[PDB]
Amino acid sequence: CLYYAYSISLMYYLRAKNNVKITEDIFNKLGLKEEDRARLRKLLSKDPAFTRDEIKTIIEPILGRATRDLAAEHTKVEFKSSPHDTPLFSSLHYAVEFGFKRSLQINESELTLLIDNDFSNPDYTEAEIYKVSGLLDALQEYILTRTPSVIEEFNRQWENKKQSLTEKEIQVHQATILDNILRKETIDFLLAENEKHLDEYREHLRREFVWGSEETLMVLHRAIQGERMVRNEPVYDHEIILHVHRNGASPGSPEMILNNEGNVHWTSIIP
Amino acid sequence: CLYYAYSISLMYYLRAKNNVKITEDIFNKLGLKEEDRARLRKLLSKDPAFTRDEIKTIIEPILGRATRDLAAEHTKVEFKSSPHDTPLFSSLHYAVEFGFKRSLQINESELTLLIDNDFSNPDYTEAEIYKVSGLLDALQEYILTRTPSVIEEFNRQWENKKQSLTEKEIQVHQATILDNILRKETIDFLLAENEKHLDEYREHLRREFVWGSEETLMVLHRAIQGERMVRNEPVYDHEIILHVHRNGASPGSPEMILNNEGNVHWTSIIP
Ligand SMILES: [Pt+2]
Ligand SMILES: [Pt+2]
Ligand SMILES: [Pt+2]
Ligand SMILES: [Pt+2]
Ligand SMILES: [Pt+2]
Ligand SMILES: [Pt+2]
Ligand SMILES: [Pt+2]
Ligand SMILES: [Pt+2]
Ligand SMILES: [Pt+2]
Ligand SMILES: [Pt+2]
């Protein structure tokens, strides 16, 4: 139950700092309407311990939605900033590399023998991008109608590369060249049509059935702290030490604490 | 290079999970003094790899020695729990079965013709127990002077089980009776004098010239996870998915990775 627990824990940190500047700045990052910013600041006074009623009627409806949207949207911007580092890349790429292996051999090409991929690796099996509605079907379509050009592009690139000839150090190079090509297929698929599939993923993560992962938590908390990299250098807006606990275990002193119960139950814990 | 690589892999796993108690439990299994537990604790911070200086002045001296010791003592513990299952049994028994063929021939007994053993079988020729200092010498002595009693014991058991006359099924039954006797010889020789030769193997495994086998790897990892069978039921203390890569190849998601380069060089791999 991540965004709820994040929200609750974020309210304890605000009421604890008693600063309208940090409070207002973070309200801004969540883009909250001033009507809602009033309901929350009422809670920031009267310190003791938030009621079940303050949570169900004030914190959950306002900061639940807003933190999920901030996590969603900030997933997108991290991807655009440096896409090969993101989980979404390597998850989607693992699928693109598996579809192309199947479509390459269907197209009677020797390039299939360069992909070792069974689409069963547990690191990728449950990636949320695979549950985006219609996405994988559009991925199959994309892999089919793009495979002739891919083979073309591999042939082109291979012939430029020729120069010993180990007959196993020369399938190194087929593999690497093909991997770079497919890594570009992965990003292009997401960036097509002013980021149609990328926005499709954003909307999926704004859906309420989608469990926030520990992955999305870290995006959220970087968005909340406003962590950036800007020309002049990495700049922050707040430093908020966060600690995750796992099945009660514990790991500077932390200002926000969540307990992660085997990735099923999120609870926040007041420091 | 196994204990070093196991140790490195164990610190990546530790640092990654960030639980004081999982950490402290495993330090307990490794029986480390609080002095050394602290030098490691420093290393499990500022995770956002480890330097060669951290490895060779901190991780290797502390965990290298402790994991070897743990692997060794736990070799002994498994043997005592169920000795015929351990490879130490199967290797020592193959030697004992070969020495007894030689000694029974020397004592001009027809029993030597029931033993099928050239001592050449490669599965057993490289057995670490054979390299234990003095051990095979003590074994010959033991076999030479125990042989009259063994002939004695085979004759006794043979008389008792006589009940017919299949011949094709007479060498069978002599063979089996003798094999059981020799298997008891094998264990006795190790448990004699309060487990003197068994402890001599333990100390051999502790001497740092002894290359960690792949077999010893799995003992250590069962000890680290505190695997046991207890009467309430086989119960664990941790589950730590380990994976071995073999000459770079790959096999749920793994928390420790070692690469085993054809049993000459061990390296760990951050997941
Ligand atoms: Pt939630
Ligand atoms: Pt994390
Ligand atoms: Pt992170
Ligand atoms: Pt973090
Ligand atoms: Pt940067
Ligand atoms: Pt080693
Ligand atoms: Pt192994
Ligand atoms: Pt094993
Ligand atoms: Pt058992
Ligand atoms: Pt294993």
Short mmCIF file of N, CA, C and O in Angstrom, two decimals, chain B residues 85-162:
data_model
loop_
_atom_site.label_atom_id
_atom_site.label_comp_id
_atom_site.label_asym_id
_atom_site.label_seq_id
_atom_site.Cartn_x
_atom_site.Cartn_y
_atom_site.Cartn_z
N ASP B 85 26.02 -40.15 2.95
CA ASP B 85 25.61 -39.19 1.95
C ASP B 85 26.75 -38.25 1.58
O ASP B 85 26.73 -37.67 0.49
N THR B 86 27.73 -38.09 2.45
CA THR B 86 28.74 -37.09 2.17
C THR B 86 29.73 -37.62 1.13
O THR B 86 29.95 -38.83 1.04
N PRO B 87 30.28 -36.74 0.30
CA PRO B 87 31.34 -37.15 -0.63
C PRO B 87 32.59 -37.64 0.07
O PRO B 87 33.35 -38.44 -0.50
N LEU B 88 32.86 -37.14 1.28
CA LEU B 88 34.01 -37.62 2.04
C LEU B 88 33.89 -39.12 2.29
O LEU B 88 34.86 -39.87 2.10
N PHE B 89 32.69 -39.58 2.63
CA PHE B 89 32.47 -41.01 2.71
C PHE B 89 32.79 -41.70 1.39
O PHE B 89 33.59 -42.64 1.35
N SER B 90 32.19 -41.23 0.28
CA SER B 90 32.31 -41.96 -0.98
C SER B 90 33.76 -42.01 -1.44
O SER B 90 34.22 -43.05 -1.94
N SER B 91 34.50 -40.93 -1.23
CA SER B 91 35.92 -40.91 -1.57
C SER B 91 36.73 -41.81 -0.64
O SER B 91 37.57 -42.58 -1.10
N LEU B 92 36.53 -41.68 0.68
CA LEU B 92 37.34 -42.49 1.58
C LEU B 92 37.01 -43.96 1.38
O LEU B 92 37.92 -44.80 1.34
N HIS B 93 35.72 -44.26 1.18
CA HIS B 93 35.30 -45.65 1.03
C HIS B 93 35.93 -46.28 -0.21
O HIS B 93 36.33 -47.45 -0.16
N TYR B 94 36.02 -45.52 -1.31
CA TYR B 94 36.67 -46.03 -2.52
C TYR B 94 38.13 -46.36 -2.25
O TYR B 94 38.64 -47.35 -2.77
N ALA B 95 38.80 -45.55 -1.43
CA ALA B 95 40.17 -45.88 -1.04
C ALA B 95 40.21 -47.11 -0.13
O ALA B 95 41.03 -48.01 -0.31
N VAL B 96 39.31 -47.16 0.87
CA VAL B 96 39.25 -48.28 1.80
C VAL B 96 38.93 -49.57 1.06
O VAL B 96 39.47 -50.64 1.37
N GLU B 97 38.03 -49.50 0.07
CA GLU B 97 37.71 -50.67 -0.74
C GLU B 97 38.91 -51.11 -1.58
O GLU B 97 39.07 -52.30 -1.86
N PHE B 98 39.79 -50.17 -1.94
CA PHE B 98 40.96 -50.54 -2.72
C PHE B 98 42.07 -51.09 -1.84
O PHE B 98 42.73 -52.07 -2.22
N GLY B 99 42.33 -50.46 -0.69
CA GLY B 99 43.32 -51.00 0.22
C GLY B 99 42.97 -52.39 0.72
O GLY B 99 43.84 -53.25 0.85
N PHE B 100 41.68 -52.64 0.96
CA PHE B 100 41.29 -53.96 1.44
C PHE B 100 41.41 -55.02 0.35
O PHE B 100 41.71 -56.18 0.68
N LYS B 101 41.21 -54.67 -0.92
CA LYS B 101 41.53 -55.64 -1.97
C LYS B 101 43.00 -56.02 -1.92
O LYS B 101 43.34 -57.21 -1.98
N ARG B 102 43.88 -55.04 -1.76
CA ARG B 102 45.31 -55.33 -1.73
C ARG B 102 45.69 -56.15 -0.50
O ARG B 102 46.48 -57.09 -0.60
N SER B 103 45.13 -55.81 0.67
CA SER B 103 45.58 -56.49 1.88
C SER B 103 45.01 -57.90 1.97
O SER B 103 45.71 -58.82 2.40
N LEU B 104 43.77 -58.10 1.53
CA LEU B 104 43.17 -59.43 1.54
C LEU B 104 43.83 -60.37 0.54
O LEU B 104 43.96 -61.57 0.82
N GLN B 105 44.24 -59.86 -0.61
CA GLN B 105 45.10 -60.65 -1.49
C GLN B 105 46.41 -61.02 -0.78
O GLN B 105 46.87 -62.16 -0.87
N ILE B 106 47.00 -60.06 -0.06
CA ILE B 106 48.27 -60.31 0.63
C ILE B 106 48.10 -61.39 1.70
O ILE B 106 48.97 -62.24 1.89
N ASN B 107 46.98 -61.36 2.42
CA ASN B 107 46.63 -62.40 3.38
C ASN B 107 46.04 -63.63 2.72
O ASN B 107 45.44 -64.45 3.41
N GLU B 108 46.16 -63.72 1.40
CA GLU B 108 45.80 -64.90 0.63
C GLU B 108 44.39 -65.38 0.98
O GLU B 108 44.16 -66.53 1.36
N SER B 109 43.45 -64.45 0.86
CA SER B 109 42.03 -64.69 1.06
C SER B 109 41.30 -64.58 -0.27
O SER B 109 41.56 -63.67 -1.07
N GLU B 110 40.35 -65.50 -0.50
CA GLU B 110 39.54 -65.46 -1.72
C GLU B 110 38.67 -64.21 -1.79
O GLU B 110 38.07 -63.96 -2.84
N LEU B 111 38.59 -63.44 -0.70
CA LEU B 111 37.71 -62.27 -0.66
C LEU B 111 38.16 -61.17 -1.62
O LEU B 111 37.31 -60.45 -2.16
N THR B 112 39.47 -61.03 -1.86
CA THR B 112 39.97 -60.05 -2.82
C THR B 112 39.28 -60.16 -4.18
O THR B 112 39.17 -59.16 -4.89
N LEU B 113 38.78 -61.34 -4.54
CA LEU B 113 38.13 -61.47 -5.85
C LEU B 113 36.72 -60.90 -5.88
O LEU B 113 36.09 -60.92 -6.94
N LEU B 114 36.19 -60.38 -4.77
CA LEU B 114 34.91 -59.70 -4.83
C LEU B 114 35.02 -58.20 -4.98
O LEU B 114 34.00 -57.55 -5.16
N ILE B 115 36.20 -57.63 -4.90
CA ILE B 115 36.38 -56.19 -4.97
C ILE B 115 36.76 -55.79 -6.40
O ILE B 115 37.73 -56.33 -6.96
N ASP B 116 35.94 -54.92 -6.99
CA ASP B 116 36.15 -54.31 -8.30
C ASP B 116 36.69 -52.89 -8.12
O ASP B 116 35.88 -51.96 -7.97
N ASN B 117 38.02 -52.71 -8.08
CA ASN B 117 38.60 -51.40 -7.73
C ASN B 117 40.04 -51.35 -8.23
O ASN B 117 40.89 -52.07 -7.72
N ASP B 118 40.31 -50.41 -9.14
CA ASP B 118 41.66 -50.17 -9.65
C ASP B 118 42.27 -48.90 -9.07
O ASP B 118 43.38 -48.51 -9.46
N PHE B 119 41.55 -48.22 -8.18
CA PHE B 119 41.94 -46.94 -7.61
C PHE B 119 42.18 -45.89 -8.68
O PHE B 119 42.80 -44.84 -8.40
N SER B 120 41.74 -46.13 -9.92
CA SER B 120 41.99 -45.18 -10.99
C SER B 120 40.80 -44.29 -11.30
O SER B 120 40.96 -43.31 -12.04
N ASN B 121 39.61 -44.60 -10.78
CA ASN B 121 38.39 -43.86 -11.11
C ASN B 121 38.59 -42.36 -10.89
O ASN B 121 38.85 -41.94 -9.75
N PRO B 122 38.45 -41.54 -11.93
CA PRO B 122 38.82 -40.12 -11.80
C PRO B 122 37.94 -39.33 -10.85
O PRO B 122 38.43 -38.37 -10.23
N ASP B 123 36.67 -39.71 -10.71
CA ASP B 123 35.80 -39.10 -9.70
C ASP B 123 36.42 -39.12 -8.30
O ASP B 123 36.09 -38.28 -7.46
N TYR B 124 37.30 -40.09 -8.02
CA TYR B 124 37.81 -40.21 -6.67
C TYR B 124 39.30 -39.94 -6.55
O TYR B 124 39.76 -39.66 -5.43
N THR B 125 40.04 -39.97 -7.65
CA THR B 125 41.50 -39.87 -7.55
C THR B 125 41.95 -38.53 -7.00
O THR B 125 43.00 -38.46 -6.35
N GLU B 126 41.20 -37.45 -7.26
CA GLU B 126 41.56 -36.10 -6.83
C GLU B 126 40.95 -35.73 -5.48
O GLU B 126 40.87 -34.54 -5.15
N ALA B 127 40.50 -36.72 -4.71
CA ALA B 127 39.75 -36.43 -3.50
C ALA B 127 40.67 -35.74 -2.51
O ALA B 127 41.78 -36.20 -2.24
N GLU B 128 40.20 -34.61 -1.98
CA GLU B 128 41.00 -33.84 -1.04
C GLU B 128 41.41 -34.68 0.18
O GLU B 128 42.53 -34.53 0.69
N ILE B 129 40.54 -35.59 0.63
CA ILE B 129 40.89 -36.44 1.78
C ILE B 129 42.16 -37.24 1.53
O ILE B 129 42.91 -37.54 2.47
N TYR B 130 42.42 -37.63 0.28
CA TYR B 130 43.67 -38.34 0.02
C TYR B 130 44.89 -37.47 0.27
O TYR B 130 45.98 -37.99 0.52
N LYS B 131 44.75 -36.15 0.22
CA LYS B 131 45.94 -35.31 0.36
C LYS B 131 46.20 -34.89 1.79
O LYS B 131 47.26 -34.32 2.07
N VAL B 132 45.25 -35.16 2.69
CA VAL B 132 45.45 -34.90 4.10
C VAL B 132 46.77 -35.52 4.54
O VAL B 132 47.03 -36.70 4.27
N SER B 133 47.59 -34.73 5.24
CA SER B 133 48.91 -35.20 5.61
C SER B 133 48.82 -36.46 6.45
O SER B 133 48.01 -36.55 7.37
N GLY B 134 49.61 -37.47 6.09
CA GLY B 134 49.69 -38.71 6.83
C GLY B 134 48.50 -39.63 6.72
O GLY B 134 48.61 -40.79 7.14
N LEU B 135 47.39 -39.18 6.15
CA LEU B 135 46.14 -39.92 6.30
C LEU B 135 46.18 -41.28 5.62
O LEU B 135 45.81 -42.29 6.23
N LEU B 136 46.58 -41.32 4.36
CA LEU B 136 46.61 -42.60 3.66
C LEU B 136 47.59 -43.57 4.30
O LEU B 136 47.36 -44.78 4.27
N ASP B 137 48.68 -43.05 4.88
CA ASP B 137 49.60 -43.92 5.60
C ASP B 137 48.91 -44.59 6.78
O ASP B 137 48.91 -45.82 6.90
N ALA B 138 48.28 -43.79 7.64
CA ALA B 138 47.47 -44.35 8.73
C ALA B 138 46.44 -45.33 8.20
O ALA B 138 46.12 -46.31 8.87
N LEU B 139 45.94 -45.09 6.98
CA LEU B 139 44.91 -45.97 6.43
C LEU B 139 45.47 -47.36 6.13
O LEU B 139 44.87 -48.37 6.50
N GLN B 140 46.64 -47.42 5.47
CA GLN B 140 47.28 -48.71 5.21
C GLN B 140 47.48 -49.49 6.50
O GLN B 140 47.02 -50.63 6.63
N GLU B 141 48.18 -48.89 7.46
CA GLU B 141 48.35 -49.50 8.77
C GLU B 141 47.03 -50.06 9.28
O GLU B 141 46.90 -51.26 9.56
N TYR B 142 46.02 -49.19 9.38
CA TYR B 142 44.70 -49.60 9.84
C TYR B 142 44.17 -50.78 9.03
O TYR B 142 43.69 -51.76 9.61
N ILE B 143 44.28 -50.71 7.70
CA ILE B 143 43.75 -51.78 6.86
C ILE B 143 44.54 -53.07 7.05
O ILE B 143 43.98 -54.17 7.10
N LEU B 144 45.86 -52.95 7.16
CA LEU B 144 46.69 -54.15 7.29
C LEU B 144 46.35 -54.90 8.57
O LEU B 144 46.15 -56.12 8.55
N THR B 145 46.25 -54.19 9.69
CA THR B 145 46.00 -54.88 10.95
C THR B 145 44.53 -55.15 11.22
O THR B 145 44.22 -56.01 12.05
N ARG B 146 43.61 -54.47 10.53
CA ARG B 146 42.20 -54.83 10.69
C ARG B 146 41.79 -56.02 9.81
O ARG B 146 40.68 -56.54 9.97
N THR B 147 42.66 -56.48 8.91
CA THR B 147 42.20 -57.42 7.88
C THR B 147 41.85 -58.78 8.45
O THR B 147 40.78 -59.32 8.10
N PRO B 148 42.67 -59.41 9.31
CA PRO B 148 42.22 -60.65 9.99
C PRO B 148 40.82 -60.55 10.59
O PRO B 148 40.01 -61.47 10.39
N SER B 149 40.51 -59.47 11.32
CA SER B 149 39.17 -59.34 11.89
C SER B 149 38.09 -59.23 10.82
O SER B 149 36.99 -59.78 10.99
N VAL B 150 38.37 -58.54 9.71
CA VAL B 150 37.37 -58.41 8.66
C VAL B 150 37.07 -59.77 8.02
O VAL B 150 35.90 -60.15 7.86
N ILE B 151 38.11 -60.53 7.64
CA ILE B 151 37.88 -61.90 7.16
C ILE B 151 37.02 -62.65 8.17
O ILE B 151 36.00 -63.28 7.83
N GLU B 152 37.44 -62.58 9.43
CA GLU B 152 36.69 -63.12 10.56
C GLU B 152 35.24 -62.68 10.51
O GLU B 152 34.32 -63.51 10.60
N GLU B 153 35.01 -61.37 10.33
CA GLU B 153 33.64 -60.87 10.38
C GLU B 153 32.86 -61.28 9.14
O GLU B 153 31.66 -61.54 9.22
N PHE B 154 33.52 -61.37 7.98
CA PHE B 154 32.80 -61.83 6.79
C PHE B 154 32.39 -63.29 6.91
O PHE B 154 31.25 -63.66 6.58
N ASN B 155 33.32 -64.15 7.33
CA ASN B 155 32.97 -65.55 7.54
C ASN B 155 31.77 -65.68 8.48
O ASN B 155 30.83 -66.44 8.21
N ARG B 156 31.78 -64.92 9.58
CA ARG B 156 30.69 -65.02 10.55
C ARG B 156 29.35 -64.66 9.91
O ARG B 156 28.37 -65.41 10.01
N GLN B 157 29.29 -63.52 9.23
CA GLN B 157 28.04 -63.08 8.63
C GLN B 157 27.62 -64.00 7.49
O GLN B 157 26.42 -64.22 7.28
N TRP B 158 28.60 -64.51 6.75
CA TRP B 158 28.29 -65.42 5.66
C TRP B 158 27.58 -66.67 6.15
O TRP B 158 26.51 -67.04 5.65
N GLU B 159 28.16 -67.34 7.15
CA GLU B 159 27.51 -68.49 7.76
C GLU B 159 26.07 -68.18 8.14
O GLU B 159 25.15 -68.96 7.85
N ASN B 160 25.84 -67.02 8.76
CA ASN B 160 24.51 -66.75 9.29
C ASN B 160 23.46 -66.64 8.18
O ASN B 160 22.33 -67.12 8.35
N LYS B 161 23.80 -66.06 7.03
CA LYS B 161 22.74 -65.78 6.06
C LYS B 161 22.48 -66.94 5.09
O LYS B 161 21.47 -66.90 4.38
N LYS B 162 23.33 -67.96 5.06
CA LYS B 162 23.05 -69.15 4.26
C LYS B 162 21.62 -69.64 4.47
O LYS B 162 21.13 -69.74 5.60
#
